[PDB]
Amino acid sequence: KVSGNYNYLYRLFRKSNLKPFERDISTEIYQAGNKPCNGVAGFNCYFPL
Amino acid sequence: MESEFRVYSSANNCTFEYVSQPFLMDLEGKQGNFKNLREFVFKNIDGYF
Amino acid sequence: RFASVYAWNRKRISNCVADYSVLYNLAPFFTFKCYGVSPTKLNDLCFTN
Ligand SMILES: *[C@@H]1O[C@H](CO)[C@@H](O[C@@H]2O[C@H](CO)[C@@H](O)[C@H](O)[C@H]2NC(C)=O)[C@H](O)[C@H]1NC(C)=O
Ligand SMILES: *[C@@H]1O[C@H](CO)[C@@H](O)[C@H](O)[C@H]1NC(C)=O
């Protein structure tokens, strides 16, 4: 669209590489350190898709 | 009798449902030489169950 | 204290060995952004400068 097809969502990070023919539905704010950054944002605490 | 048809209290959007004929069941059963003996093995490879 | 947006202070593309591992993983991160290469992948791209 001229306003942008803002419907399909891509991923850019995961804890480990996934085996083929596998799908996930869950979206959780990431934690990538010793501090359990659950929260809403922080050090590598971003929205998945 | 079997009450609690919805053993799950809540269900989100369900990805797939399957219904078919049941397995080789036996009604009741004589004490000694029981007709029912379930021998199941469950395996997965790359999405195949 | 370095220069402003018109004459931004650049360290030239020339010949010093660095370490992308510990330099990119500091604790106080508030705003990090990369377009072409994903921000989760910085270590495995290196040249002479
Ligand atoms: C299926 O779910 C499990 C969670 O139970 C995933 O296992 C996790 O994998 C990450 C990868 O680094 C680990 O950090 C977690 O510790 C694992 N969880 C547990 C409980 O050990 C698994 O990766 C999922 N399957 C796929 C294909 O992604
Ligand atoms: C059992 O099967 C019938 C199909 O006639 C369906 O309507 C019913 O919801 C099923 N019950 C359970 C608990 O799966």
Side-chain angles (χ1 to χ4, degrees), chain A residues 19-23, chain B residues 15 44 46-48:
Chain A
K19 47 169 49 63
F21 278 7
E22 296 279 347
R23 205 196 277 130
Chain B
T15 175
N44 64 307
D46 191 74
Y48 274 20

Side-chain angles (χ1 to χ4, degrees), chain B residues 25-42:
Chain B
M25 280 214 200
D26 299 302
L27 180 56
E28 302 182 352
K30 192 254 291 179
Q31 199 89 38
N33 189 12
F34 292 109
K35 320 281 175 52
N36 289 309
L37 172 54
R38 301 298 176 177
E39 181 95 336
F40 275 69
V41 58
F42 313 83

Side-chain angles (χ1 to χ4, degrees), chain B residues 2 5-6 19:
Chain B
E2 189 259 340
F5 269 51
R6 308 264 84 85
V19 65

